Each structure stands twice: as structure tokens, then as C-alpha cells.
Amino acid sequence: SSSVPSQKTYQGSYGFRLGFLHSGTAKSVTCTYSPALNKMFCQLAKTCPVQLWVDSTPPPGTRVRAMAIYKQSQHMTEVVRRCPHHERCLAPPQHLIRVEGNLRVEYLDDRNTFRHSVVVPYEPPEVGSDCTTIHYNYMCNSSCMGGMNRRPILTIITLEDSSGNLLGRNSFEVHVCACPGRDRRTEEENLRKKG
Amino acid sequence: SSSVPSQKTYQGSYGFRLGFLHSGTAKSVTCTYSPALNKMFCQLAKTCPVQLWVDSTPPPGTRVRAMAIYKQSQHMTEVVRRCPHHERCLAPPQHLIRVEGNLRVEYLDDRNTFRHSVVVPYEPPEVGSDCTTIHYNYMCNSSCMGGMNRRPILTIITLEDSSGNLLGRNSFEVHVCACPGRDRRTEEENLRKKG
Amino acid sequence: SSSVPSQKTYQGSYGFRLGFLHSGTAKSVTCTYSPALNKMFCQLAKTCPVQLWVDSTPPPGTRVRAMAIYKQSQHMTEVVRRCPHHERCLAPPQHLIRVEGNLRVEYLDDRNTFRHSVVVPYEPPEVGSDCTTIHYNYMCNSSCMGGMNRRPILTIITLEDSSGNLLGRNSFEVHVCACPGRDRRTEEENLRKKG
Amino acid sequence: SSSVPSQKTYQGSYGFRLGFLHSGTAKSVTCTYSPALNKMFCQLAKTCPVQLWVDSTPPPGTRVRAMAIYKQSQHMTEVVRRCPHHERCLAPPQHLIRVEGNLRVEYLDDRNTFRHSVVVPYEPPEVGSDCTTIHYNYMCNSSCMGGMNRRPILTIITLEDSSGNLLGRNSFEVHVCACPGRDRRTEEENLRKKG
DNA sequence: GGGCATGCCCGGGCATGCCC
DNA sequence: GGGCATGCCCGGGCATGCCC
Ligand SMILES: [Zn+2]
Ligand SMILES: [Zn+2]
Ligand SMILES: [Zn+2]
Ligand SMILES: [Zn+2]
């Protein structure tokens, strides 16, 4: 059995999709999302709100899981972990991705694949709104030595029922950096000029 | 009975064929496939994704075997092994080909032919995709002294049922090297100018 | 009592001084010493030869101690350590400075000051030469996150008798980096243009 | 105590010096010596005759020892060994340097420094000649992967009495290669043009 | 002996954490 | 927000085992 989780978008029978909030591109804005690149640019240990959108309401007991994988083919089979520095200085210190502001968060270390994930219960949007927001946190920069070490990652968000069935899957690239607005504008300019 | 395994393409009743991802020809790209040559150019100990495509779904318990053989007639009967340097510094150290990212990988040392092979279970593409990707690893350069020693090899991929029936066979040439982009462009140029 | 060791040059009654071998300024030469800056530029985990010169021969049992301290006033009281990444992947893993090629090397963790040092016996130059060379090793880049973190250090070399009397002291600045030739030429140019 | 043996020439009270025979510079001559570079160019596993010259006859029981060390500073503390390939395919297989045609040859693995050496008894030149020749053999190319790996070496010849006293020391650089005449002419031309 | 292929050295230059 | 320093990617090119 493969230890590499799928990243292919699966909107599923519930119409599962992600949403992200517009940001305003200061050089060091705390987070900013590029629709053209399907890529979040954000700062380490700071809030990265992700919206959950569904056409049909999931069944009770549905869970929302987040997992990071390296985007490039030569690194895909390597588990994404926190670097030794940020690990040394609740959430186990080896986990890259945290969820803030949720009382039912669980951190999994898969017994077979060794991959990390963080799971919270799915809550339908309150009577009166269109989506559900999760406050994620990335605890390393993409550049961290001994961790992501300048390798781009994807975050895989899966909607799963209590029985474990995959109900939906979406993914976005993440670049954790000191200056999200600068790096977003640079990669988007490179895309237009040399893409 | 012959100890030289067949390399002849046998697409079989299941329409078995291999696929490879386009790469972009940097001089030292980690892997790049040449369709004109049916030849993978890749770097040692780095991921080499190979796609499995089928027209019909194989029965349960189907396995996928990979095995290296020397391409040239005068070397065909010699077992392809890891060189002593890379052998010394679950995969046995003598095996050239490894599979990354699979929990059910098996390494075989044939009791009679002494040939090495690595086997994983066949998994059908997930509901929502067209092929299955295996992450292969070549643990020597083609040039390694005491190993391949600058001799070209073929990788033979066989689809086999649990009973051992050959369901399909495909093969591609491999050149493991420091600069796959350079060597691919050089051989393709030699093919055009002097082939 | 102060836990900050002295860096002031004390050539002493034995005429103790340090020497360094000229290098040739390739961009990524493994080590190169700048006399104008009294500064070694070297690569991590690679040999950095340091010459011991004396006018008078030290008594038997003399020892040679090396110790790193931060050069800048605001960091001087912080112990120089290996960063967590290089620590994790006879020399204790927390020590920045190692000595290669000596059978009588000792690594000290000071019980009171917590500072690290590495000591070898002093050997007089062999009948027929002018100095004694010690092969030092710096196990982090100056830029290492969670370690030196881009802060310049000094290496303090003390000649001590077996009783612990300070016989001599010398020091040089160290910049461990990927391209010692580039960084040396850049700092020397900044010194000339704006020093 | 240092584990790096001295390479400094010590002609000593017996006037100890090496001699080498003129060769004639075919591209692949089996061995050829460059006086300008004090450097032997030779082929692997082939005879490399070295002459021993003395002004005064050594005492009975004098021994002749040969030992290889890396010439460059960043490799000097590493023991010079045979590569895994030539080790796998009398003299222990890990030893680079052998002596041919001598019935009293000894191979030492130093218990403390781990360095290899090969020793034969010193014989004075027969009544009627000026020097004594030893037939050395280098069992790897300088290029061998996992061995010298393209790093230049020195051979240190020491004349020692039976008690262990150093009587004399000389050294020459060695380049073991397929084409000694080509590589000698190339390095000598580079010396004139860019030295 | 002439010349090719290939592992790796080499300097130019990019990206990114952080000083200013 | 502008700009510097630095680890490392990148293509040019050298050296060397071996084919011819
Ligand atoms: Zn980190
Ligand atoms: Zn190998
Ligand atoms: Zn470090
Ligand atoms: Zn060898």
C-alpha cells in the first residue's frame, strides 16, 4: 500500500471546495492567497484562515483533516516535519501544521506511513453564513534548514466521515516566508514573464 | 531453461503500458524521459516516477515487478548489481532498483537465475484518476565502477497475477548520470545527426 | 567571577602567536585567512589548519585550548553552541569546534560558565620545522538558525601549562560560510570603501 | 598525539634521498616521474620502481617504510585506503601500496592512527652499484570512487632503524591514472602557463 | 595516439531572512 | 518598503577512463 497520500482534487458528492480571504499586498502581509497559482503565502506561527465551502451538508461526525506533502517529485515520499530548531523552541513539536481556536483538535502520527495530520470536527456554517473557517498555523518557514529546507509543500484538506470514508479533498500550495507579499508578487511576475 | 528474462513488449489482454511525466530540460534535472529513445535519464538515489496505464483492470492480487538487465548482447547474461562502493555506504544493499513510498515492497534474489527484482502490489488508479505511479530509485550511476560500469541497462516492468502468470510487460532504457538534461540532449542530437 | 573569557592578545613570555597558510581566492575555497581583518573564512565541517608559533619552548604538559565567543557586545555573554539541526545529524554534538587528527583531544563543558572548549597537548615542532599545526573543524555555518544565527564569533586560542597557568592567548575572527573567497573579498572591499 | 604523519623532507645524517628512472613519455607509459613537480605518474597495479640513495650506510636492521597521505589540507587527516571495488577483486586488500619482489615485506595497520604502511628491510646496494630499488605498486587509480576519489596523495618513504628511530624521510606526489604521459605533460604545461 | 563521455569543479546569479 | 548577505541552483567547462 502506498504511503504517499493523494493530492488530486475530489469535490465529491457534497461539493467540497476551499475559500481564502483577500488580503491587500503589503510586502510583509501576514498571509495572502494567489488564485492564479492556487498558493498561500504566509508567515510562520501566524494565523492562516482557510474557508470550507460545501453544496450539501456533510453527515454528523464528519471530520476535517490537514496534511502537508512535498510538491516536487523527488521529495514526495518524504514526510513533512518541523525543523529541529523550531521543534526545540497539545500539538506535538514535530508537527508543522497546527489548528488554533478549536477545542476538539487531534494530532495524528500515522502508525504505518509516519505522516503527520491535524483533524478537527466539521461544523456547518452558523444559521446565517456561507462557509466555515479553520485557523491553521505553519510552524516553520519553507526555508527552514533541517525541515522543509526551501522545498515547496502542498496542504491537503480532506473531508472524511466518522467511518473514515473520503468525502472530499482539496489542496493548495504553501510558501511560508518572512515577506508573503513580496514573494507572491515575485512568483506571479515570473509566471507571466517566463511561465 | 534461460536465465535471461524477456524484454519484448507484451501489452497483453489488459492493455498494459507505461507513462512518464514531462520534465523541462535543465542540464541537471533530476529525471527526464526521451520518447524518441524510450529512455529515462535520471540521477542516482533520486525519485523516478513511472506511470502504470491499463485498458482493463487487473484481477486482485496482481503484482508489479521491476528488473534491470544489460542492453548490449555481450553483457545480457550478467546480473545487474549495485557497485561495491554504493553497496557499502528493507532494500538489500546489492539491489540496484528500489521502490520508495510503498509499505508492501518485496525484494527478490532469484534462487536459480540470481537476478534481482523489486515487487509491489498493483493498485488501480483512485476513483478520479487515469494511472498509477510507482516511485523507483536507481542506487548507482550508469558509470559506476564495479557495477554497471558505463553499460546501458533496460528496466523491465512486468504485470503479474498472484499465480505468477505474465499479464503484461514493458521496458525502457535507463541512463543514471549526474546531468540527465545534458546527456539526453547529447544522445538525441547524435541520433539525429548520425543515427 | 566573570563567565566571559578574555579575548585580549597575550603573547606572553614564550612569544606565542598564530599562523595561517595562504590559500588562493577561489570563490568557494575551503579556507582563507585575511590578515587585514584577522579573520578566517572557511566552510563547515572542513579542515581549518592553524599554526602555533613560539619563541621559547613551553614546559612539558602544556595544553592548547580553543574556544568560541560572540564578537559583538550584545551577544558576548551567550555561549556559542552548535545549532539543533547539525547537533542532531568523541566530540559532543553540542560543541561547535572540533579538532581533527589528534589522539589526545579533550572536550570540556565548563561546570560553572557552561562554555565549550576543545583541548589538545602542545607538541613542539619536529626537529626540522618552525611551527605546530592543529586541524580545527567548525561544525556550523555562521548563518545557522538556532546557533550562531549570522553572528560573528572569535576563536580564542590559549596556551596553558598543566597547572592551568595562562601562558599565552591569541584570537581570530571566524566566518563559516559556503563561499569563503567571495565573503572575504566582499568584506575587504567594504573595509576599503567604507571602513 | 597527532595521527597525521610528517611529510617534511629530512635527509638526516645518512644523506637519504630518492631516485627515479627516466621513462620516455608515451601517452600511456606505465610510470613517469616529473622532477619539476616531484611527482610520480603511474598506472594502477603496475611496477613503480623507486631508488634509495644514501651517503652513509645505515646500521643493520634498518627498515624502509612507505605510507600514503592526502596532499590537500582538507583531506590530510583521512586515512588513504583502497576503494571498495579494487578491495573486493600477503597484502591486505585494504592497502593501497604494495611492494613486489621482496620476501620480507610487512603490512602494518597502525593500532592507534589506523594508517596503512608497507615495510621492507633496507639492503645496501650490491658491491658494484649506487642505489637500492624497491618495486612499489599502487592498487587504485587516483580517481577511484570510494577511495582516493580524485584526491592527490603523497607517498612518504621513511628510513627507520630497528629501534624505531627516524633516520630519514622523503616524499613524492603520486597520480595513478590510465595515461601517465598525457597527465604529466598536461600538469607540467599548466604549471608553465598558469603556475 | 586521437578523441568522446561523464562526474564534478567553477563563477554567475537567484531567493529569502532580516537589517536599515 | 528598500536593500544586503548568504546558501545554493545553474550552465560552462576541465580531467580522466576508455573506445576507436
Ligand atoms: Zn523551522
Ligand atoms: Zn555505484
Ligand atoms: Zn548548524
Ligand atoms: Zn580502486
Residue numbers in the entry:
A (entry chain A), B (entry chain B), C (entry chain B), D (entry chain A): 94 to 182, 188 to 293
What wording appears in the published article?
The human p53 tumor suppressor is a 393-residue protein that in response to cellular stress, acts as a transcription factor by binding as a tetramer to a wide range of DNA response elements, activating various events including DNA repair, cell-cycle arrest, senescence or apoptosis. To uncover the structural basis of rescuing p53 mutants by MQ we investigated by X-ray crystallography high-resolution structures of the core domains of mutant and wild-type p53 bound to MQ in the absence and/or the presence of their DNA response elements. These studies reveal diverse binding modes of MQ to specific cysteine residues that stabilize the proteins and their interaction with DNA.
Also analyzed here, are the crystal structures of the corresponding MQ-free complexes referred as R273H-DNA and R282W-DNA (I, II). Crystals of R273H-DNA were obtained in the presence of DNA and MQ in the crystallization solution, but without traces of bound MQ. The role of MQ in this process is not clear. A role of MQ transiently increasing the affinity to DNA in the co-crystallization of R273H-DNA cannot be excluded, although crystals of low-affinity complexes can be obtained due to the close proximity of the two components during crystallization. The replacement of Arg273 by His or by Cys residues eliminates key stabilizing interactions between p53 and DNA, causing a large decrease in binding affinity, whereas the replacement of Arg282 by a Trp residue results in a significant conformational change leading to protein destabilization. This pattern is observed also in the current structures.
